[PDB]
Amino acid sequence: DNFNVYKATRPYLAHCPDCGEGHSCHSPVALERIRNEATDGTLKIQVSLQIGIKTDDSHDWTKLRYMDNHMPADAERAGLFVRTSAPCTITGTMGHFILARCPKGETLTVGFTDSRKISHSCTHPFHHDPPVIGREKFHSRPQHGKELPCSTYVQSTAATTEEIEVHMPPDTPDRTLMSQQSGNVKITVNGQTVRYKCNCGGSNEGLTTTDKVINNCKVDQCHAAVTNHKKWQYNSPLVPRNAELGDRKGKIHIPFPLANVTCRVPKARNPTVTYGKNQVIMLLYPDHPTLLSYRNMGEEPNYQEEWVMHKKEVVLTVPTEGLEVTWGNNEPYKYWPQ
């Protein structure tokens, strides 16, 4: 129980098409992969930051860690928000993964508030319209109802089945490493491994752990980057691959896997029925959109279906073979003439 996978990994900065107002940025809350495989409507969202873990690698549910330019910084879990058209209800949070129940929307936004009060967000175009479980379009899940097979991402913190690819981060460019020393270029290492390249005859191109000086050179004619081989980062398509290593990769187990569960669906109230000669009359009173379907119990079934929205009276002919009527999630009503 002394095992901590989060000490090897780190939160990161990745590309986001909309950070707010309609402009792109290097987001600390950048969206990776939004999974909508769960039939119950639950979304499995992947983000560049890590939730429930502090910068010192210790686990704290009220804490959140994001990449603050060069080094990771701490933020509050309460400040984290998920929204489409209206705010989403967050059900589970652990590392790079968020579980949320979202209403009908065209875009998905995931944001948070840092220690300095600045709000960071990321918007992706995501068509969210969860499918109807059963034959009734209900808003709230009942405690009792018809048991239907449905899928959801389990609230459990335990990571055992699903996995993601992790690797070394690319070299982080930093112009502050280079300074103009009338009239030379000085590279201030500051205890870091720096990869440099200059358009000057003095120094060529290489890797350094020591302070370098480029005699008769301009700062604009030079490029410097910070190397990091001590941490792991998710194999993100929004972040460049490590130029030197490349194919070198690792793998880590992820929380909230998709599982086969049971969904409770409500049964619409039985309609008032009046019988006629070789026909049946039903006064349907739906509280929500309910599917009405019917078939003949003979050689020719002649299946017909309609979604009933308001108070409606339906006239259905009952043949010699019999007529089977299904009103929403209720068990089918069978009719036969005397």
């Binding site: 002394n2 095992f3 901590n4 996978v5 000490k7 090897a8 690797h167 070394m168 081989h229 001590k230 941490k231 792991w232 070198r248 990769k249 690792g250 793998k251 880590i252 187990h253």
Partner: protein
């Protein structure tokens, strides 16, 4: 019976030579060791043992 690799020496995945605290002692070579054992079946036994300290 599952075995893991380190440069030219073979060791059991659950029992690495770096233990205790593999990442704390050497953070660079621990990740490098794990990167070389990804195709191997006992990778998660090595991942659990290497990232365990106190």
């Amino acid at each position: 019976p599952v075995m893991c690799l380190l440069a030219n020496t073979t060791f059991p995945c659950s029992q690495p030579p770096c233990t205790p605290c593999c990442y704390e002692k050497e953070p660079e070579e621990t990740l490098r060791m794990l990167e070389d054992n990804v195709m191997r079946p006992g990778y998660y036994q090595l991942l659990q043992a290497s990232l365990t300290c106190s």
